[PDB]
Design a protein around this ligand. Structure first.
Ligand SMILES: CN1[C@H]2C[C@H](OC(=O)[C@H](CO)c3ccccc3)C[C@@H]1[C@@H](O)C2
Ligand SMILES: [O]
Ligand SMILES: [Sr+2]
Ligand SMILES: [Sr+2]
Ligand SMILES: [V+3]
Length: 327
């Protein structure tokens, strides 16, 4: 493996990470109150859960994974059209909603063993969809339907979260969910998995993420610096609560800290829908939940200012919010 991809010793993954048997799997076709209670418990104790019987068509999930795999099978010459000035774009502000291929890493500087296609999805209009990949031919029609369906499911989950917290329904149906970034992640086979990371350990900086996977590689950090493997369920969504939701709930909910490990023999594609605030938003603990017993743990901050730190400073998982901590 190229020196560029060698992770610092302490960040390298151990070869045998155990299955997370305690990852909540939540059936959304249970009675309404049972769903609210199970989602609430998962948000308080874990910050990562899977949803099944979630109402999003299994056929559409399969068609979306197919067209995403088809995109990454495209020739080099086609992929160049998504590389501004001949190279992948960087995860840095301004983060544009037009489709680009991205490189990612940490500044002991190293790169993640990953190619990412990213674009905005909300609101859908001709200008946005015309900025998506031209190939495969069916990408735009399949991913347009997928993005609307994933958003509908995410807003359902945010209203379950509202009921669990005692916030009015639709609390997040505003500026706090107006950006929908779809990240299609491609992990090619890696000759030295013991030295590399597909994705470094992170909170998602946004509000909430729905992740579609069909192969192993996703790992979560739980108490006592233990990593566990998240079982791939091809017809489920992994829900990762973001650092933004951790702040707004005043740490009543956990954020998901997770990473992706490489594989020596086979490639892997994942589809992450990252929903969260516009860069113009002010983030603070929900005042409705604050009291003398529950004082705010964060001062109000600019999401844009947070974003710059979150994307550049990887010294700690919550480096993005450290400047805004109080009490
Ligand atoms: C592994 N990387 C993490 C950081 C970066 O995330 C982003 O780029 C999101 C995209 O919404 C973002 C969130 C909050 C503020 C700025 C950007 C790209 C990817 C994501 O999978 C999460
Ligand atoms: O992510
Ligand atoms: Sr190039
Ligand atoms: Sr175009
Ligand atoms: V993530």
């Amino acid at each position: 493996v190229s020196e560029s991809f060698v992770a610092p010793l302490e960040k390298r993954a151990e070869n045998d990470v155990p299955l997370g048997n305690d990852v909540p799997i939540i059936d959304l076709q249970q009675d309404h109150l049972v769903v609210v209670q199970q989602i609430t418990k998962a948000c308080q104790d874990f910050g990562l859960f899977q949803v099944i019987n979630h109402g999003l068509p299994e056929k559409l999930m399969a068609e979306t994974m197919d067209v995403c795999k088809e995109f990454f099978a495209l020739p080099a010459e086609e992929k160049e059209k998504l590389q501004p000035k001949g190279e992948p774009a960087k995860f840095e502000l301004p983060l544009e909603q037009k489709a680009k291929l991205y490189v990612e890493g940490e500044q002991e500087a190293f790169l993640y063993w990953k190619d990412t296609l990213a674009h905005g999805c909300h609101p859908l209009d001709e200008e946005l969809v015309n900025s998506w990949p031209e190939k495969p031919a069916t990408y735009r029609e399949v991913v347009a339907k997928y993005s609307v369906e994933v958003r509908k499911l995410t807003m359902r989950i945010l209203d379950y979260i509202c009921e669990g917290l005692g916030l009015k329904l639709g609390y997040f149906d505003n500026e706090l969910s107006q950006i929908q970034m779809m990240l299609t992640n491609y992990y090619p086979p890696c000759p030295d998995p013991s030295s590399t990371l597909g994705s470094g350990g992170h909170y998602d900086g946004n509000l909430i993420t729905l992740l579609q996977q069909n192969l192993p590689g996703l790992q979560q950090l739980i108490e006592d610096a233990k990593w566990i493997a998240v079982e791939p369920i091809p017809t489920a969504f992994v829900v990762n609560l973001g650092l933004t939701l951790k702040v707004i709930t005043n740490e009543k909910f956990e954020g998901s800290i997770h990473r992706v490990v490489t594989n020596p023999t086979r490639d892997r594609v994942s589809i992450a829908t990252l929903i969260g605030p516009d860069y113009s938003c002010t983030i603070e603990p929900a005042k409705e939940l604050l009291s003398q017993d529950n004082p705010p743990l964060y001062k109000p901050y600019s999401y844009a200012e947070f974003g710059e730190i979150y994307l550049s400073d990887k010294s700690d998982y919550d480096a993005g919010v450290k400047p805004y901590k109080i009490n």
